[PDB]
Structures are given as structure tokens and as C-alpha cells.
Amino acid sequence: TIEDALKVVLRTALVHDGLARGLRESTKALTRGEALLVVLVSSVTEANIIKLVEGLANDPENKVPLIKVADAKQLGEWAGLGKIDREGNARKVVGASVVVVKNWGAETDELSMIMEHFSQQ
Amino acid sequence: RKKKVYTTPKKIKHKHKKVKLAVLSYYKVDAEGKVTKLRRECSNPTCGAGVFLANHKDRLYCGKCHSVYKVNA
Numbered sequence: 001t002i003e004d005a006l007k008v009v010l011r012t013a014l015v016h017d018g019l020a021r022g023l024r025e026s027t028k029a030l031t032r033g034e035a036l037l038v039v040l041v042s043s044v045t046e047a048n049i050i051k052l053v054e055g056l057a058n059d060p061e062n063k064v065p066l067i068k069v070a071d072a073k074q075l076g077e078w079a080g081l082g083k084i085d086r087e088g089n090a091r092k093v094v095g096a097s098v099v100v101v102k103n104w105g106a107e108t109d110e111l112s113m114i115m116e117h118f119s120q121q
Numbered sequence: 122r123k124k125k126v127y128t129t130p131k132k133i134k135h136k137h138k139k140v141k142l143a144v145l146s147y148y149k150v151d152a153e154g155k156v157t158k159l160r161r162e163c164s165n166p167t168c169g170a171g172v173f174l175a176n177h178k179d180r181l182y183c184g185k186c187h188s189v190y191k192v193n194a
């Protein structure tokens with residue numbers, strides 16, 4: 001439970017339609033006040049998705065949430081991309097790089113837990 | 122019935138399903154600076170500076186509002 005509970009803050013976020021999944025979507029979404037928590041890959045390739053979304057979320061005003069995690073293929077199952085098959089093993093999905101969140105669909109204590117790790121260590 | 126010769130001139134031109142383009146969202150990129158934006162947006166009542174503008178020959182689009190926003194320089 002050492003900071004891999006970001007799945008459950010994302011999973012309750014999806015049920016209240018609050019993930020602007022996708023490089024195009026996220027970049028559009030976080031170029032407004034919608035940017036509420038952001039999740040990034042470490043690096044996929046060629047370093048420029050890494051440059052681009054970081055510079056937009058590093059604006060000179062308060063809107064700087066940023067969380068740095070591992071490769072994208074896991075991350076799509078960490079978000080909602082449907083591969084349930086009513087819990088069956090089959091992965092029919094792809095992996096996203098940048099998920100930006102709006103409104104997080106919840107009141108979770110893990111939601112309480114997560115920002116504090118984002119704030120204090 | 123008599124016959125079906127399918128007489129008419131052949132105009133089978135079923136279209137392109139908007140060919141997948143390459144890496145997009147090219148706002149601008151700035152070496153150690155804040156990035157400005159190519160392709161000017163729109164002062165609308167809904168669109169919250171997220172929709173860009175096509176740069177045509179002598180006109181600027183919208184895309185989601187399909188209305189020209191060009192003004193004289």
C-alpha cells in the first residue's frame with residue numbers, strides 16, 4: 001500500500017466521468033482550470049511528451065499538481081480502459097500516458113491520503 | 122424483371138475516414154520559457170480557450186463551432 005493506491009482514486013474518478021485521458025484530451029483539459037490532479041509516465045520515448053505536458057502543468061500560477069509513475073501499459077488498466085470481461089483475464093486495451101483528473105468522483109480517505117504524500121514526505 | 126446491366130459511369134469514391142495524423146497538440150515549444158500558442162483560439166461564450174483555429178489561406182476556422190473568426194491585420 002506504498003503509493004500504488006492511485007488506482008483507486010482514479011477508479012472512483014472514472015465513475016463520475018472525470019478523466020481526460022489522452023495526450024490531446026489532457027493538454028486541452030489542463031490548459032484551463034480543469035487540472036485537479038495529473039498523472040504522468042516516467043518516460044515512454046523521445047522525451048517530448050515528457051517536456052510538453054510538464055511545461056503546461058508548470059504554469060506561473062497555483063495549478064501545479066503532478067505525479068510521476070511507471071510505464072504506460074500498466075497505466076491504462078490503472079485508469080478505466082475496459083478489459084473486465086466480467087473480471088476475466090483478457091486485456092483488450094492499450095495504455096495511456098497522461099491522465100488528468102477533474103473532480104475525482106469521491107470523498108475517499110485514500111483521496112485524503114494521496115494529497116498529503118503530494119504535500120509532505 | 123428483365124436484366125441488371127449496372128449501366129452507370131463508375132464513381133465509386135467511398136471516402137477517407139480522416140487519416141490518422143502524426144503527433145498533434147503543437148502549441149509551441151520554448152527552450153526554458155513559457156510557451157505561446159500557434160493557431161489562435163476564440164473569444165466565445167462557451168469555448169474555454171481549448172479549441173484552436175485552422176489556418177487556411179486567408180481565413181481562420183474554429184473546428185468545434187465551424188465559424189470563421191478571421192479579422193483584418
Ligand SMILES: [Zn+2]
Binds near residue numbers: 163186
Ligand atoms: Zn468553439
